[PDB]
Amino acid sequence: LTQYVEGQIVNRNQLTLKKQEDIEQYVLKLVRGYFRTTNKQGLNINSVLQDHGLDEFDSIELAMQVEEDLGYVISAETIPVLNKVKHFVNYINHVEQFKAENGKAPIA
Amino acid sequence: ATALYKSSALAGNLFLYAYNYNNFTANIRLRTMRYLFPVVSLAIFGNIYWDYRSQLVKVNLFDEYIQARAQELV
Amino acid sequence: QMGFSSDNPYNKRWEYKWKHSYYTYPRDYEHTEVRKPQDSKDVPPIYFAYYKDFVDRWLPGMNMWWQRRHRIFDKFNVYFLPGMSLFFYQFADLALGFKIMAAFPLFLAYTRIRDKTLDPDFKETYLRDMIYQNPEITKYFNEETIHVLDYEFEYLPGYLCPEKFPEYQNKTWQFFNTDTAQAEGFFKFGDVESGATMTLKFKTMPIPGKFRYQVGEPFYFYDLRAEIKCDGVYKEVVLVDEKESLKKIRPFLFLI
Amino acid sequence: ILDYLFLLDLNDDLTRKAVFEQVIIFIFIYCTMNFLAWSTVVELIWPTHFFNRRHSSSQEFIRFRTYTEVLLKISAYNDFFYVLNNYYYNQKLILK
Amino acid sequence: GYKIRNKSIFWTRAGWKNNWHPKNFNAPRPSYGEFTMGIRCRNDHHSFLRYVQTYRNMSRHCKQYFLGDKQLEETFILGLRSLFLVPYDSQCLTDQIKHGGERRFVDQLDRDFELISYNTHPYQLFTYTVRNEHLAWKNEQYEKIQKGEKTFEQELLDYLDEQVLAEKAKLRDGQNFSIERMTEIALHVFRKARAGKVRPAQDVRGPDGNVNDFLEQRRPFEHPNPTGVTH
Ligand SMILES: CCCCCCCCCCCCCCCCCC(=O)OC[C@H](COP(=O)([O-])OCC(O)COP(=O)([O-])OC[C@@H](COC(=O)CCCCCCCCCCCCCCCCC)OC(=O)CCCCCCCCCCCCCCCCC)OC(=O)CCCCCCCCCCCCCCCCC
Ligand SMILES: CCCCCCCCCCCCCCCCCC(=O)OC[C@H](COP(=O)([O-])OCC[N+](C)(C)C)OC(=O)CCCCCCCCCCCCCCCCC
Ligand SMILES: Nc1ncnc2c1ncn2[C@@H]1O[C@H](COP(=O)(O)OP(=O)(O)OP(=O)(O)O)[C@@H](O)[C@H]1O
Ligand SMILES: [Mg+2]
């Protein structure tokens, strides 16, 4: 559960959102944290990542970061459809609903 | 002389592996050598010692017979 | 259920389909997070490439045969072919033709065991073309915004109810098959644009098509149902109903 | 202890086949031959790589940066390069 | 300086500059269902997702040895994208390749990842060496700054700022201190500083300002020519 951060081993922390308002804030904080993102303040819930300097390969790096922060195991079949901020918010909810009803994580 | 040379040539292979240990161990393109070098090394050792051991047995059989057969003829 | 499964965490429904170009197997299984240099083992042990091929290729292949072993326990594979092999094996030393006629029934059994233990693969492109043609589904789902949450598809064990499918009460067919060759499953879908989810349940069976001896479609959806759920709307779509399909077409009853 | 280890014998090989002593001669020659041929093939890709990476670019097309060219520009720049950029920045962007 | 004169240099039997579908005798031909009994083919529609997972792996498996260096992770990403963007930006029509360029490139990236999973890929070892040399130079600057000492890089910047003031105080007729003029001033200093490293500045003469250094010299008694004879 530990990772290196600037040469120092730090314990990694996982988040549990379970709330709509907390998801929209996390995705924006996530997308605004990526060094390739343009117009970070012009970014909203209905923002197309293509309009902010992000391509298909950047959505992967973002999804890879969602697994780090939330502990999800995202399949390669789901990544290429995450092209908007709205998509990350709805996917995160669909995963929380799946685990709350089916008692397990979705197929990876 | 033959057993000593073949033992030195086998030791030469062990140096070649040690001199190139980092490559044989970490580079996967040389994995087959890493895996089968000792099998070939044992098969080489076996031939060296087998021949020495067999020659040694025969020499001892030859020596014990000429001594026994000689006393019978005396 | 997926029969071929390694310790790899990603892409479970594609593990048997993907043909990698690796000379050997990767040192570690696909990482689910960024790890430390000390979490992994440098210069993996000797004979590691062989160990991986056994636990990543051989072992999951035998777990597939064991998972679906109930589909090969037919009197033809169990008694007939092994008995045919023993009859000619007693004369194997007389000529070569006896060695052949004794090994052929074994190669034939392996082929039936091989094909019957594979994961049932339907033509998924035919399926998606079918649902994306329905307007009630395209309202909430699109290929550019759809994602898979769960997948299940497995053969049905034993013979079915002998009133809905009287075809399988055939002693000649039962001699070759102990299963039905039908499969049942579902698809858990989600749309990241509309926020909708649906469970696409389906039942399949092999059917004959346009020909006398060959099967037309080994996995024909004779029942296809979608239970769509949205923000506050629940819909139930019926793309293929079994009551209307079973009156037009009947199963195929594979032999050999 | 088993009889399979008898294959290690070469003192009395003339009693069974006397073939091992002549076959390995070919194997050593075959290895030497393949060593000369294969080493020539895999080594001689460097003249083409050296020439193309230095003479194949043209002005009517875009030359895209490679992985190595990215690491060198960002993590292998020298002192003169660091000074020149800050020298241009201070004079024009700050001091005009 | 020198241009290729042959106008037919880029000609192939398949067209001009065609490196995607070279002309061969056994050319691809169609297949008809009604007449085809069986077929053996390895082509599939799995290359897209394999192109996605291959990126996720090569990125995540390389970051294991970056030690949390954020500036290196971002630099590596830019380099990783340059490797995956080759089919999208090349002159070669990757969509017209002989038997599917998608499967070809994906299978090629898989061979790179295999080496990456073992931390034996030459791009990895090159990144470690390049980065260590960079941090050794950055730490040298830090150790000199904590002591209040001046770095060799700041001494140049200050020496260049004052030279600009001297050159523009006489440039009154015009008032366009072009970027060209700013450049030749810095390069002239660089050439003198570059030669100063091998021959440091002893006196007011400056870096590499002694003629006696270029008189006849001899190898020291303790370090003779080890590789060849001397006479
Ligand atoms: C014209 C007259 C003709 C005379 C004939 C003789 C001609 C000269 C022969 C020269 C070749 C033989 C070398 C003999 C030693 C000479 C000294 C020397 O090396 O030169 C100075 C040499 C420096 O070289 P340099 O020229 O000045 O500059 C080099 C550059 O810097 C670059 O640095 P570098 O390190 O990369 O350079 C390496 C350098 C030097 O490399 C070395 O490190 C020298 C060590 C070579 C060892 C040879 C193998 C012996 C294995 C050990 C046997 C031990 C037996 C007793 C065991 C007792 C304990 C139980 O070159 C070599 O490697 C020479 C290798 C020669 C080819 C061997 C090929 C063998 C396969 C073919 C077999 C053919 C049958 C005959 C085999 C006979 C074997 C007995 O000095 C050193 O290297 C100091 C080493 C200090 C630490 C050594 C620690 C011990 C290492 C032992 C290795 C253990 C291996 C695994 C165990 C095996 C046992 C089971
Ligand atoms: C009385 C003695 C019994 C007879 C002994 C028979 C020995 C059989 C084992 C040696 C033969 C190995 C030949 C393999 C050649 C083909 C390669 C291969 O394996 O493909 C696997 C393949 C793997 O899949 P694949 O290779 O076809 O494709 C994989 C696709 N990707 C890459 C995308 C994943 O699977 C199978 O072929 C099916 C499983 C066959 C199992 C083989 C026999 C296993 C025997 C188990 C019982 C043995 C009991 C003895 C142990 C007792 C305790 C010590
Ligand atoms: N039109 C074709 N032409 C030549 N070879 C083919 C063709 N279709 C399939 N093949 C080969 O037969 C294999 C299996 O085909 P199949 O359609 O069952 O794959 P699939 O991944 O299950 O498709 P889907 O996702 O639609 O279910 C393929 O991997 C291919 O090697
Ligand atoms: Mg399929």
TrEMBL record, chain A:
Origin superkingdom: Eukaryota
Residue span(s) of domain Carrier: 21-96
Protein name: Acyl carrier protein, putative
Annotated organism of origin: Tetrahymena thermophila (strain SB210)
TrEMBL record, chain B:
Origin: domain of life: Eukaryota
Protein name, entry field: Uncharacterized protein
Originating organism: Tetrahymena thermophila (strain SB210)
Automatic annotation (TrEMBL), chain C:
Superkingdom, natural source: Eukaryota
Binding site for Mg(2+): 121-122
Keywords of this entry: ATP-binding, Membrane, Metal-binding, Nucleotide-binding, Transmembrane, Transmembrane helix
Residues holding ATP: 17, 123-125
Regions that span the bilayer: 72-89
Name of the molecule in the record: Transmembrane protein, putative
Protein species of origin: Tetrahymena thermophila (strain SB210)
Lineage of the organism: Eukaryota, Sar, Alveolata, Ciliophora, Intramacronucleata
Automatic annotation (TrEMBL), chain D:
Transmembrane segments: 23-46
CDD domains, per database record: ATP-synt_III_subunit8
Membrane listed as a keyword: yes
Keyword annotations: Membrane, Mitochondrion, Transmembrane, Transmembrane helix
Superkingdom to which the source organism belongs: Eukaryota
The protein, known as: Ymf56
